[PDB]
A paper describes a structure:
To ascertain whether structural divergence drives HPV type specificity, we scrutinized the crystal structures of L1 pentamers of genetically close or distant HPV types. First, L1 proteins of HPV33 and HPV52 were cloned and expressed in E.coli, purified, digested by trypsin, and crystalized. The crystal structures of HPV33 and HPV52 pentamers were determined to resolutions of 2.9Å and 2.75Å, respectively, with refinement to Rwork/Rfree values of 21.0/24.0% and 18.7/23.5%, respectively. Both structures show a hollow lumen in the central axis, and two neighboring monomers intertwined by surface loops. It should be noted that the surface loops in the non-crystallographic symmetry (NCS)-related monomers within the asymmetric unit of HPV33, HPV52, and HPV58 might differ slightly in conformation due to their intrinsic flexibilities. Then, five L1 pentamer structures representing two groups (group 1: HPV58, -33 and -52; group 6: HPV18 and -59) were aligned to compare the structural differences among their five surface loops. We also observe that the surface loops of types within group 1 or group 6 have quite similar main-chain traces, with minor differences noted among the loops between the two groups. To test our hypothesis, we genetically swapped the loop sequences on five surface regions (BC/DE/EF/FG/HI) between the two most phylogenetically related HPV types—HPV33 and HPV58—and generated 10 chimeric L1 constructs: H33-58BC, H33-58DE, H33-58EF, H33-58FG, H33-58HI, H58-33BC, H58-33DE, H58-33EF, H58-33FG and H58-33HI. Notably, five of the nine HPV33-specific mAbs (C2C3, C14A2, C16D7, 9A3 and 7A3) failed to bind to the BC loop-swapped mutant of HPV33 (H33-58BC), suggesting that the BC loop of HPV33 may involve a major neutralization epitope. Analysis of the extracted cryoEM map of one 5-coordinated HPV33 pentamer and one 4E5 Fab revealed that the 4E5 Fab is bound to the outer rim of the HPV33 capsomer at an angle of ~58° to the pentamer surface.
HPVs are non-enveloped, double-stranded DNA viruses comprising multiple copies of the major (L1) and minor (L2) capsid proteins. The native T = 7 HPV virion can be mimicked by an empty icosahedral shell, called a virus-like particle (VLP) which consists of 72 L1-only pentamers. High-level neutralizing antibodies elicited by L1 VLPs can block HPV infection; however, protection against HPV infection is type-restricted, and there tends to be little cross-reactivity among HPV types. Each L1 monomer folds into a canonical, eight-stranded β-barrel (BIDG-CHEF), with the strands joined via flexible surface loops (BC, DE, EF, FG, HI).
Numbering used by the authors:
A (entry chain B): 19 to 56, 60 to 175, 183 to 404, 437 to 473
B (entry chain E): 19 to 406, 437 to 473
C (entry chain D): 19 to 176, 182 to 403, 438 to 473
D (entry chain C): 19 to 56, 60 to 176, 183 to 403, 438 to 473
């Protein structure tokens, strides 16, 4: 049908509630997960992962309100609207490093590699790098949609297909090598560092999400990406598509067999700073750009976050044997990464008058809304999200919490 | 039980006072303290580093025992007095500059920025002498309660059944930030002494220390808001170099992430990478200090009330971390000989705390006493003198005594003059 | 007594005057002065460096003896006149640029940025020829009192050989070295080997303005106002040769053996770098209008003199000069002599406002407490031991403001 | 005399005119000009040169106006006033490189040069660098005045330095990071700076002298933006003319017996060029000048001085001498060329001057040639880029980009 703003059929009340997730912690390995010598022994926790929080809200129609005289349950139903959001972030600012002990890096081509080139059977090197810096935040009542390139269906070069998937908690953000399925498009498992070489890097499909009719994916969003090229390398292996003859004059002797033009850069996120921080500050959802003005259908909200500005990897070191002199054989080296979150919300209570035209519109939009309201199995159960249960976390005492105090000043309340 | 703003039970007066700490100096060694090879537990050269927290415990005179010229502004039978902080400037001397830390035996193996070709040759001891500049940090915290920090330490492991791996379990620990504690430097906020056994993975000024980061989340969400009247912070860093560690790799790369090598690439190289930080450049424009802050409305419920007649000023300033090179001549000669000179390193810190305080009165009604007792009973204990030791003594602070430093002549001091223009008086 | 603003006992008139120093030039060697080899304790080539303080002592004509066209605007029986500074522009010539300092025999041992592998090779003399660009600094101070600086010197000797450090306040003189990235310390007395910092500071003292002390002095005669802009970052990471005076404690490392048996020097030191000079960050060649000072002296130039203190390293370019001793058809190093010279170009511009002071009994008591020399020169030089760049403006005052650049700007600013 | 603003004796009319030079192109070699084995074959065209345009205006007293009833030629004379200016710049942004195949560079002293030093007879190297970035714009009816350091009069072999003021001519070299000096006379070895300045003089605008001149004819207004940093640290070969004093260092021995050269010098770098930092391709409206001449173009001429290193890209050209199936270096010749594209746009306002006895006395004191040309070429020794606009004035302002902008600015 013709989509209308929620402001036309969802009534706002003066009832507000605060809800906080409290400290959220993830501790794990930044490059790979550790399996049980049989489930996960040590999870993969990286600053380059998507954090997709599925925040569960209490059903307002079954909520224990002190006074339920503000609406008529015979003809009306209740729904929460998000009006304030602050994403707390702990831990200091810092930059981590990823790498590969056997990266397919051949020669440094920044100042030039003189002829002749010597390509043996295995010239992989141990190289590491810092990734492209990314901060982003998405808010909606529907999980976010990402885009990435995978191997499609049919030189033998793989066909490229742009694939849309739901971004799950733990998915890898793009790091400077693009949003692609590195497992299926890079067979040697050695062209990108190990924390993505068997993974898929996804980029938010902002274009698709903003153009969807009802606007359930993006109540609003913020994003800040930056990177530059730090080093200039080339690949080892057969060059799949040779340079055409009309683009160069053939060499002779030392320059007879041409060198590999399969170049690749290493990225660098440059500096992280406090002023460029997107987080630890409130966002007030006054007017969404989509038609859904922050209405949390189904009593759930999705907060999607990427934050590489706190990607420091901690070095842990144990001593196996105590000796009076230093021996490398006496110590084991470990790496660990942590993430500290604290989600804060301010919700506004809303009522929906269920006329025949309103029920028809809602049924077109989403039939499950009317069934859950008991009027006219989780399809998202196949996906992985960070569940945040706030059913027992709602409070009407706004000024007893930081974001609630800010909301009272913002709305002048 | 329901926390309310101090604006509801603390009455403001038109009485203002200035107080200044005058020059505060700390001179010492930036990497370690030097102990006395003799009694008694005293220090020859203290550890003074630009990477340290400065936690000042500012003692204020008890206004209930203060010699006021006219005490007709309140009723001591039913009321009590307390100071409220309304103005603060953190003076900083010495020029801007950046210091450097390092380790003569740092566990640095290979440079992996442009790649390290195979094979790698790891002998018994490949430690090198390397140094670096740290992440730049400016921050300042103000409250009537000492600040709370967070860092990672060694926890306890579940040993049932058998050991999963010898990697130490990590636990997030909250402690009070004491004067002299090390700020995070780019290697995280952790207990390096207990989590890095080889004493050689980070420079020596933190390798036997704990780096702490302020638990801003915990401090702002605590109900009464006595820790943070306000705060300012400015952090920046980038990755300068890319290295890897020597020693046994505790957790090997799984097989599905690479195709095994052969010959030169048979023994995989260490993927225990680590960066060196860099705070980039310090500039005058980004300075947090040497400017006044006016505390008009705090975000917490404590609107600058200095309970217990004390204030905590927490400062980190790495923008003046210059380490001075000192050089003595042992033997006089006409030609240069390396053994005729001794090389020393010293670091200095120059502070000057300035405040403007507002006198306040509290009426001890039945409702006020019930509330204050819930919040903090020690407030009512210090007030009570008849009817009808140090809880923080176990911690180390830079004591700043202002009991004899309060002055009512505001226009006679720099911050007092600024306050008069700001408030229009 | 209790200090009050000059606004309470100094009356302003509508009489304004312009004064300009015209072009001021200093030409010399940036690293050291060249003294006379025979028959003289005078200098052939002065030390002129972009890292020096310029402290101008500006002499103003006594307004009480000034040849005014009509002197009926005040009563000489009960009043006295004094100049107040209301406008200032510090003109700077020469293009923006960065100079370089160094030391042919600097105590640099190894580069410790990517690591120095063991073992270390400490011979008898490993000093190297090294150069660097300094921390960038712009600052400007204005007062009727010479500026006060701070630096670290050798203290009172009072269980090791490390010198005790003492914070010293001195008057900043014209030609003193500003801090360059190694701190404000007496390098001649605190670094005996003369080889830890470049030669243009290794036998000098670097001073930093004691802003805290100057702003806290009661009358506020030192800083009518000030501007400052400093920046630097660490460019390189080195360590020192020589005996390590204070060894690393044993609990901070596990001892090595064989190649790593003899521990390396942890006496690290950085080289600074001022990054870029830009037009946007220039403090100079723009006017400053002194409407209300933060101190109690609101720009009143007691003693008919003003001190202008400037540091500007954004024009520290050192020119390379090359002479040909023998003309030859091919290039030979033995035919040329290499010289280095540095120049500084200033142009001080002022707008002064004439003021009168009514000498009542209460005012005379206050002024006498503040400064007794003020009332005696009125009828109603301990600074000779210091070195300043004397700027004589006694014959440079003009009331025709619109005939000069700063004067035209002032007329537009105040709407006159 | 006593100088007064032109607003006091020059009356403004509501008559405005547009004038544009159209495309201005210069193509040449960025390091040196090429002369014939007999004129000029290839001029020296570099992004480090001053462009000084001498703009000729039509004499308004002899201009063909449609209606001349707005003034009395018996008692008045006409003059143009500049009220709008835009300096059009074509070609993309980019940075060029200068160098010297035989530069007097000895050792790299950035991380240290270990002893002993090996100073042979000729240790010059082939080195190149990017220069200090400079954007500047000057406007007046008098050519600009520059400053540079030259050899003074001798009164101990260091040359005496003297500060010299000259008129900046089109083609003069701006300072590049080595100062504003006469490199031909102050650097005898011809190898201390790159070849495009080593036999030239780098000049810097004498802003102080021009702003302090009484009538203010050189600078109606100006804009400037300079930036640079030190990229590398070197030292010079040759005899050290002035040795380090003995009290500043402890004598060496053995390998460190013979001290190394402390004749250090930096290489500059202009860092990055950006669209945001552009001074050009935007209009400047001359509403009130800081000098007393408020944009009055005495003598029917205007001088526009421009420096722009943000388009200093040098193009590499390569010809093929012999066709062969494999690559051989001797079969190709390598050339270097640089280009500059300008487009000067002006908006002029017609003004009338009533020549009373007081006004004529003032004008004659200021400049006697003004009244003589009014009937009521001293600069032939200098080189300028001549811009003839005598046949380029148009009263149809809304037909041109700058003219449309002016109509919006003044609300006309």
């Amino acid at each position: 049908s013709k989509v209308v703003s929620t402001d036309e059929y969802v009534s706002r009340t003066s009832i507000y509630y605060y809800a906080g997730s409290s400290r959220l912690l993830a501790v794990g390995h930044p490059y790979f997960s550790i399996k049980n010598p049989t489930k996960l022994l040590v999870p993969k926790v990286s600053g380059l992962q998507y954090r997709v929080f599925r925040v569960r809200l209490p059903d307002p129609n079954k909520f224990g309100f002190p006074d339920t005289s503000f609406y008529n349950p015979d003809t009306q139903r209740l729904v929460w609207a998000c009006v304030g959001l602050e994403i707390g972030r702990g831990q200091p600012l810092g930059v981590g490093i990823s790498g590969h002990p056997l990266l397919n890096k051949f020669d440094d081509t920044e100042t030039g590699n003189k002829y002749p080139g010597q390509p043996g059977a295995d010239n992989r090197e141990c190289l590491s790098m810092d990734y492209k810096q990314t901060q982003l935040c998405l808010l909606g009542c529907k999980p976010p949609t990402g885009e990435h390139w995978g191997k499609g269906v049919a030189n033998d070069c793989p066909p490229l297909e742009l694939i849309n998937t739901i971004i799950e908690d733990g998915d890898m953000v793009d790091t400077g090598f693009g949003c692609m399925d590195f497992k299926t498009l890079q067979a040697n498992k050695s062209d990108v560092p190990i924390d993505i070489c068997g993974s898929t890097c996804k980029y938010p499909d902002y274009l698709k999400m903003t153009s969807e009719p009802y606007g359930d994916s993006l109540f609003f969003f913020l994003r800040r990406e930056q990177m530059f090229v730090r080093h200039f390398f080339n690949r080892a292996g057969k060059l799949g598509e040779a340079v055409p003859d009309d683009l160069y004059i053939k060499g002779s002797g030392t320059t007879a067999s041409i060198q590999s033009s399969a170049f690749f850069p290493t990225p660098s996120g440059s500096m992280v700073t406090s002023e460029s921080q997107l987080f630890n500050k409130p966002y007030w959802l006054q007017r969404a750009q989509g038609h859904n003005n922050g209405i949390c259908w189904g009593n759930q909200v999705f907060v999607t976050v990427v934050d590489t500005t706190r990607s420091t990897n901690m070095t842990l070191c144990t001593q196996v044997t105590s000796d009076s002199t230093y021996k490398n054989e006496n110590f084991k080296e470990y790496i660990r990464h942590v993430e500290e979150y604290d989600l804060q919300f301010v919700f506004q209570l809303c009522k929906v008058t269920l006329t025949a035209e309103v029920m028809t519109y809602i049924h077109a939009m989403n039939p499950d809304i009317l069934e859950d309201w008991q009027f006219g199995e989780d399809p998202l159960g196949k996906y992985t999200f960070w569940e945040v249960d706030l059913k027992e976390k709602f409070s009407a005492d706004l000024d007893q919490f930081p974001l609630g105090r800010k909301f009272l000043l913002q709305a002048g309340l």
